[model samples]
Target: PKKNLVIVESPAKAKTIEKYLGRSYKVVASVGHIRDLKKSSMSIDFDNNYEPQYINIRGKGPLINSLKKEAKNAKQIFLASDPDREGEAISWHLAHILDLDLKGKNRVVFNEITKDAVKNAFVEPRQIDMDLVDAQQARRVLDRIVGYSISPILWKKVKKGLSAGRVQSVALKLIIDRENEIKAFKPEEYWSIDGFFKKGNKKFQANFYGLDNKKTKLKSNDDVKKVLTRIKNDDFLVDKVEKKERKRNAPLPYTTSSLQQDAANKINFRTRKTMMVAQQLYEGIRLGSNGQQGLITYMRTDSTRISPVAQNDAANYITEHFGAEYSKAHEAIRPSNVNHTPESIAKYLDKDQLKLYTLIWNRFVASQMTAAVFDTVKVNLTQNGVLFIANGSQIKFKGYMAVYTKVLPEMIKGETVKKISANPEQHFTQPPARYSEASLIKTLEENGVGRPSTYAPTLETIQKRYYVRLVSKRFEPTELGEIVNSLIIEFFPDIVDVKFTAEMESKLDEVEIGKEEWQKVIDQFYKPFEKEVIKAEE
Candidate 1:
């Protein structure tokens, strides 16, 4: 008989942990949740304080049986699921299915699935935290109530197969509103006058600053013509020169939202793709001689926090490899093992894996490095009260930029600028840019509309529902998406209101930390929400 039995969420994760725990224990994967609310009906007892009716997910019976068989032989059972609310709930469910007494130390968790982490977690096992379990259940029930209730209204009013979500509907509304703004947008024309000047061999350009340094916007080509004619005969001279030293700190490490945004901008990866690759890195990757190793910490974190051990390792690595001046005292998300640089293990990883791993490594390394310094100069030129401004900068120290540079334009100051010409350009004001998937995720995070775990799924859902489509890498609302958003706003304004949604998330956080009860929170939302549903039906 096995001495211990361990159950985790994914097969891949199970395999990695099994390697860490040898033959004394049996490790198995539950393959995600073994049970969920029934699909055929509400599956919730609305009359009995919103109790959810869960059933063993169809096709998972064999998996449960296998787990039960293992439980009988094992003297001890450890539920080592992912270290999140959903993971907590999985362990809670497993306890019920296996009929384990919940009063024991059955739960073990770690941010990464390394051998040391896995072993350490087992030594400190504790019973499942019911606060986290209840929070997960609350979110599940709230989402189900929102989707099951409003989606039918959408089908009847707009079209069949249309659905509404607590978060996705808000996202849909944002896209539709932006699309309408674009449709109603009107462009206005403007003109600019630029001076092209040279001092001896040096050349520079600046925009016309208007008469007497009061700032100027040329309204038309005729206005440009007047400015050009006025400055055509004037002798240009440097009026004012300002120089200063500027310091720029390195960027914070990848929280889920920032990582998704950077991946979209840098590698042209979708939000879903970023999360998928990050999951592999967080679970375990097969390095050449090292076998299986997890590369990063938990990826679905909102905080830019790093552990002290990781910081000490990074400090040592920076001091040894790149000198002490490159090291900073602040913490940011970093790898579980700082010694395993991407270059050391690149050959063992696939194309996508290498790209993502490199991004994570470089970003973390850079976060611990020194701030970049630069000398900035601003010059004001004047020719007969027609003022022109020019700015220039040069890097004094590459610092963190040596690892990951976000390049910007730079120019040398104090060049010859007497020889010159006048140029006028016409332009029109552009409408606001539509949200790219990256930008939308950024907006959602900035507004606190969703948590780190929900960003990828929420963005993916709106697209899958055909409420929004990606055209030229930016979101454009579909006609069906706009219609559903319109009806929801007309009927259920609170669900799509950004402030209201963020408040709901705050309440969920309160539930997780035990500041408030989950049922009361749900009761508060359902009372008003159900009324809206009934009113919409009427």
Candidate 2:
């Protein structure tokens, strides 16, 4: 008889855990979701407090049977799914299927799949968090209510295979609204004058600040000519010189949103790709001499918090390698093991894995390092009551920048002045930028629209449903997307309303933490939602 039966989501994760667990515990993979809402019908009963009818998911029969056979002989069952709401739901479902007691400590969770973490989790198993399960249930039922009901309206009005989601619909609306704004945008011409000057063989440029240090923008050629008319060739005088030291602080650690955005902006990886690679790193990577190890903590956390143990380790490492002056004395995003530097394990990783792991490693180390110091100087030149300014800065100390440097702006301020050339060029105001997957995820997180796991999948689903397409790595809503979005906006404004959706997302979180009841959140949403659905049908 098996000592304990452990179930996880992926086969790779299962293998890693099985190895870590040794011979006493048998680990298996659930292959992601084991049960879901029925495909053939609306499986929610609105009359019975939105009671959901769950079935053993098709294609999972063989796996279920195997698990059942194992469950009968196992002394204890450990539902070691992912450390998230969906994972909790999977465990909850498994409990019902296997006839395990939820009230008992049957659930085990760990942020990373390292041997230490896995072992520690098993040593102190927590009971199934029903709050988290309820939250996941609320999201699933709500999405079902929205998708099964609204998708038909979209099909009848637009085309077949078209669907709308509670989250993706709002995401689609954001894109459509941005596209419309771009179409309706009118460019206005504006100009600015840059005065080129030389002082003792050193060249610097200053922009034309209007009369008496007032901010100025040249709207027309006449405005440019008037400025030119006033300034005499030798009349430029040094009015003021200011010098100061500036401290540039390192960035905070990567939350899920920040990590996704940074991966997109720095490595050109899409959100989906970012999460996929992060999962592998978090689960376990086989490094030389070390065997399979998790490189980072859970990838889906919203919190930027670092454990005291990690903080102390990073602090010691920074102090030893870079000097105490370079240490921030604060926790930041970092690897699970400080000794497992990227250089030590680079041989084991593929190109994509190395690149992302390096990105995470560098960011984490940099965040704990000291602030970079800069010597900045500003010069104000005056001619005919106009103030022209030049600013320069030089690095005095490279702190965290030794590990990573994002930007360095150079400028020098001195005692002499000479002019070279000055001209006003015409420019126009452009429309707001289209959302890249990165920017869209950033916006959604900022607005509290969805959770960490939902960002990548929401984007993939909208594209799959033909709601939007990525052209040149930016979102552009499709014709069908726009039509559906507009209809929803008119009839069901709250469905796509950014603030409303964001608040609803907050409520979902409340349910997860036991701060609010899941039923209340669903009840609050469904009341008006039903009215709009009926009206839209008419």
Candidate 3:
């Protein structure tokens, strides 16, 4: 009797998933990717729609043989890899390795690895999520095309081993340009003066704007002098006072960007660190009672929401543990349209329990429990016909902020907060911060310029290629990077252009959704890009 063979990406995950299945199904793990383009040469056919020349990863050959041997004997095969694009690719790799028929013995993925989730997957296994796979493939091919075309130029003109990239080179150019702008920047000086006036116990400061019933742009020394002439060392008198009470709504749950930003601010963690930690939490944890549960949903998502059940669970937990007021009276958190649809063509993760999924499920469920509430007070003080302002806030309730305290800015419900007299002091407007590895990945994601699977690797590639270096987490471009970026911009502006990358990403996403054929999309991209390549060579 032939057994049903199930394959996953990680051995640790396999251990967890294995428990959910019986003796009839043999679970296997790929560990990770088993094949990639060889590093020694430019392994791409630019003449052929930028097709990559992939080979069996040398050391992993034994593993591939073993998997193939297993697959030959098994009655059926199921590919359960990571729920992301890279995972889809890995699933494809395993399928190709096992010689599994494309139509049958297919692909499955669950965000959380649990009995119900695993069983559900078996109950309804589909083919590979082709959009995600194609999206991944498109990015890989693009990388290959860029790497192959650019490295040779670098080797000839700059230094050996130096390389250029699709995203990082562009990012590097931005930094270099900004640096040059700063170097050439001549700061035109201007000044402002404030008058402090006291009424009863309340002290207020008013800046010299609209003073003497005149308004002027504070652009030059003459403008500063004019403003000073109007309110020079004058004792400010309060002309009017107005105060308004405003109820500020709670912040939505963590979208991937907000989550990473919060994690960085609160814990000094990078985006990658936050996601890595969050992934562990999302997949599974020993919560004492539940054995293993996903702490959050997929950490690599653009969604800010929870299910009705999760919301109810949050409310119940709040009512039982932190009192009813801290919990939502009804459904508190608004459902987000940014949520990924399991029924949709793209799939980062489905709401199923995989090792990493249980962690995400719990966190998402917890987020739905309550709403953070705050009362905002705005004060407008008019002194000698000049307006002075001070705004203060007080938290009325620590709803979801109770758990996700990293998002809470200092004060919680019932706690008064104020900016000091000398708060937010003026400093030179800084040049835009350079992209950190985490932020670079995030930007790539937001702009839809790169696949999710490519974010980390792309950053790594640019850095390794000596095109850029990390200095205190910020990407600083090298001389070679500057040179290469200039060439790319001059010759192939459209290919390296962020808009083009973003549009291509969207097109690849369309491939994922089956909105367009993959070949058609690739063909269009390649025709123009390849034409550009030939023109550049000329």
Candidate 4:
């Protein structure tokens, strides 16, 4: 009965999965990809319509043979890799290596590693998804083509050990161009007039609106003096007042990119460390006995799409534990078992693990709660025909704010308020900020440039190759980066074009969903990109 074998992407969860499936199944980890395009040479057969020749990745030979040995003894081999294109590719590779039939019900997928999720997956094994495999293959092949063809040129042109990655090049350019913009930026002097007013016992601040009730920029220090000169007395008339209650929606569950940003901003974890801790949460954590398999769902998806089952479960848990009103909306990077609160499993996790797990738990729970409401008050004050506006806001209800955990005051029309003082402050216009890991990932996600799995690697690659430097934890393109970027820009401009990379991602997505053929996608890109590489070579 234990002849059935299951394989996953990483080793940490294998024990948990094995225990859940009982004696009927044994679980193993592939550890990651077993084969890749041979790196000793181009490893791509351009003459054979761009066929990628796969070779056993160095040091993975023993792992592959070990997997084969397990497959030989198993009555059924279920390839249960991660639920993503990259995992799909690994499963496809495993199928070929282990002699599993492509048409057989040998592939299984589970977003979360809970007992139910894992057991349910085993009962409904499906055939390999070629569309997904092909999508990943397209990315791998295209990246290889771009990387191998262009890296040499860069190495030769600017010493050695430089890369011209399809996605990383765009990232490099974004940083370098931002640096250029900062260098070329000229700061212009500006000033603002702030007036302190007192009504009853309440003191409030109002900023200078305009010369005569019209909005205008105070671009000079003299402008501030001129604005202040208009006010004759220390009393101002209350022009208008507005009050309203506004609702701030609860933040959605953590998509990979958002998680990366939040982790960086909140815990000061770098993108690499964030991904590392997140993977551990996804893989599963041990708790004294048989603990919660995986703390959170897959951490690589950008979608906040929630499962109805999970939502109902959360709703039930919420109404019982939290206030019924708090249970409203439904969820992403969420907990596998809502019952396993952070405090419940606090003993199981170390410092970083607990930090990440609690973040996931709170974020997911908050997403299922009601919106936080705020009371806002806006008051317009007029002094000597110059209008100044002030606004205040306070939280009306905690609502969803209790998980992670803001209104205005009132003024009547035709009322006089005493002005305490008029103060002028000097300011200068500033340039844009350099990219932080979080900001860079946000930008990449906005442009559809890289996948959830690729953001960390892309950031690391740029820094590792000395293409960019981290000063004050922000990206600054190095001289080497600038030189390589210029040459790549001059020659292989297509690779670095944000739109080009985004377009490729879209095409790859289309291939994944079976809307387009992978070969055609590859061919379309190659025809133009091959020419650029050849031209650069000359």
Candidate 5:
């Protein structure tokens, strides 16, 4: 038997990890968190740094006892939970419950659980990261404070089963307000015209519309009619013909939100379903007679970067198969991200690499090996004083088009075009589209309003409580959602202001980085927050 016991959060992980170790290392699972706050009553120590009161989870009681027993027998213990703040907190709790000397036990985390990674981690294991622990603790305490205090109001005023959260409640408010905006919106009208023409064996299409005399800004129907009349007065002649070559780089690897959105868009899978599929692929799935294959790395990541090794692999693959011309001399550029950290870098990998490098490598290698070339032909014609116009486009190279074409496919080379000549037309302008779960999560991330760990739960709470409902993949507020959101916004405006939340998120991040004291941050928050709560109550 191994002298040291390795405890993880899941039996499936325990089983998978066991084969990676030998006689000196024994692996087991805690079966998720062994303790949580008592749900029946408020278990927050609000007077003492907002400390939490925890107990052995009913379902995990046996697991806790087993861990205690193992700790008593083992020479040394290694807490190898997920490499996240939550995982670190769990490790801390495990150590405390087992009564292990914090200085003696080790906290082992790895980016990937491949054979090499497992062996490398064992070569140089480290202790639990307190920064991560504090980050998680701050969030936990914030949750407790909100859940315990705000929940009662919800239970009394709304439904007993419903609850509110700090970030999610605000997110709910946004959706609710958006629904109101949509309801109150007024539409404006616009029009488009198309004309088809035949030039002997060739056919093309042209569009003519009314334009205001002042620099061709089409506005009222009269403007369009005037342009149409002017066109009617002269024969439409070919405008300056222009053809240019353009290359669109392949898409970057998927981040958590993008992956979820793409899966929903391409495969018609829900966010939860896509995550489950990604998790299975990441954790390793059995491939018929081929044993198991880990198709992807961890899926719950925000960074859109791929490692150098993966990039090299993609280049090699593309060059070998697709020829040199299709492969680019440089990697594609992605937008820069702020809020960058060592922890975030670690969240991706040591080198700040994208977890979905493998996926992107496969995609880009196929796309870069082809050419996307086309030509544009603009023509004008005039008949009986009415000026007619037509435009045509022809595809020259369908290189990458064969493999992956995003959205609509390219038109065929010298494809026939259709044209239409109308007097004039008008159409109404539409309001902004409602935010989807994926898009909302992305917005939160971009604005640095919410932590990554909070994304799913935030989304979950809003929908589960009927704060928002999915209407054609867009969020529309429920009646209750609207009422509660309006109530909160009306009474507690500071808490829901996007700027305030973002600034609060900044302070919490400072706590994680140890640049600012958590107590001071909390003090500043609670003072104003408490004042608001009391004022709202009155």
Candidate 6:
């Protein structure tokens, strides 16, 4: 057995980290959390300052014994769990289980599981952060109190095995609320007129700007007819032309919410699938002689900040390839090594993994590059007192376009415009769009209702419980969703309240940062929440 012990969260990460530690340190996986609140019982003692009683998760007896044996023989033990609130709780639980001193310097954290990052972490081991653990504990206890207390009554009124969650219930309510909006929406009839013009073999379109140069809305076919009467001849004049050079700033790199949205929009991936693949990338992958190494920074984060050294590494790469003019900044959910270009490591990654890795890599590299420049022209056309508008933009410089591509069109001013066709199109006012995985996650993030780690799981839970269903890749509240939502809305409005969930999350964050005590936060929430639960039960 090795003299030093290192514990991680997953088997794959442990195997990869073991190689980095060499001969003296033995790396092991806790294989996720070792203990959890009892599933069949209310494990929180609300009367005892909301203390939660946890039991060792089922079927881990042998694994526990082995970890115990390894810990006993080690000269030192380092609880190297993931760096987050839940991870701190895991380290705290492991500390209690393995009989390690809580005040001892046994905690180590690394942002990315690279050799240097990992080795450097061990050199500066710190004590487990009780503040983070308390935050996690508060969240867990509060969730348990909600689920264990309300879930049974929900089963009595609806079906068994149905569940309720602090955040998921609020998410369900959002979906249901949108469904009601769609149901009650009135689609007022509308119309618009456009003229197609021929300019030197190229055809262009110009829309009706207004009746008398003031922007106007056409409400009906009578309104459409009023606009068409203004145009007598098929010819139009290019009366005014405005041109300017514009720069589109390089897109900011991926935060958790943006990555989920981008992955869903571009790659057609579900939020759950995106997270699962991202975890595999963050954990470790074998690439030629690099052996097993983590390929990306931690995926579950809101920050776009990257270190200066990493920025220099990316700047050098940009200079060597796309030239120095392109390089400018730092990072986001970027590759751990810029040298591991997606194409270079394509053979080592699965198709979906490569696609996602390519997305992150390109976005990150582009974030460091300069803004793309475009030449734009805004043209105004006139035909018998009715103004028409046409606009164009073309790439003037590729800049970061060498990495991520965006596009436009081109036109010139003072040209003879041949009116090819006069067109009138009918339309109706539209309701709000149904929530897609990407859009819903974005809304949840914007509202601060869930953390990066909880978004995917909350989505999964709502769907799993049949509160929502996907139709054409968009969320539609099911009948079950409406029934449950209506009950919660009437009985326990605060549980399904968006602002309430967001407030709870910010309070939890304050707890993690030591701004608020965990018990006080829980006390404030549980007292009000307990009254509602009691009322609902009756």
Q: For residues 352-378, could you state the per-residue lDDT of candidate 3 as single tens digits?
A: 223123223334434545565666543
**How do the residues 286-348 of candidate 6 rate in per-residue lDDT, one tens digit apiece?**
886778999998888888897888889999999999999988921368899999999899999
RMSD for each of the candidates = 2.7, 2.9, 8.0, 2.2, 7.3, 2.4
State each model's CA lDDT, in order: 0.84, 0.83, 0.60, 0.85, 0.62, 0.86
The clash numbers for all candidates, in the given order, read 4, 3, 28, 8, 31, 0
Lowest summed-lDDT stretch of 10 residues in model 5?
329-338
After the best TM-score superposition of candidate 6, give how far the Cα of residue 109 lies from its true spot, in angstroms: 0.3
Model 2 stretches astray by more than 4 angstroms = 329-333, 405-416
RMSD of 4: 2.2
Q: How far is candidate 1 from the true structure (C-alpha RMSD, Å)?
A: 2.7
- Consecutive 10-residue window with the lowest summed lDDT within model 1: 405-414
Better of 4 and 6 by lDDT: 6
lDDT of 4 by residue, 349-385 (tens): 9999999888888888889988888877778898777
Q: lDDT per residue, candidate 2, 1-538, as tens digits?
A: 4588998888878877878889889888888777788999999887888878898899999988888898998989999988888889999999988998888898998887778889999888999999999999999898888888887887777776767787887899889889989999998988889888767566777888888678877888998898888877754677777788899898888888888889988998988889999989877787766567778888887877778778788889889988888886112235888777889888998989888889998888888888999987777888878778877777889999988522212333434477788967888899999999889999998887977878989988988877789988899988877788887787778888888888988999899999998888989999989999898889
Say which candidate scores most in lDDT. 6
TM-score of candidate 5 on Cα atoms, chains taken together: 0.82
**Which one wins by TM-score: 2 or 3?**
2
**Model 5 lDDT tens row, 334-389:** 11111122233333332212323323333434433455666654444444333344
Give the CA lDDT, 0 to 100, for residue 443 in model 4. 96
The lowest-lDDT stretch of 10 consecutive residues in candidate 3 is 329-338
The CA lDDT at 359 in model 4 is 86
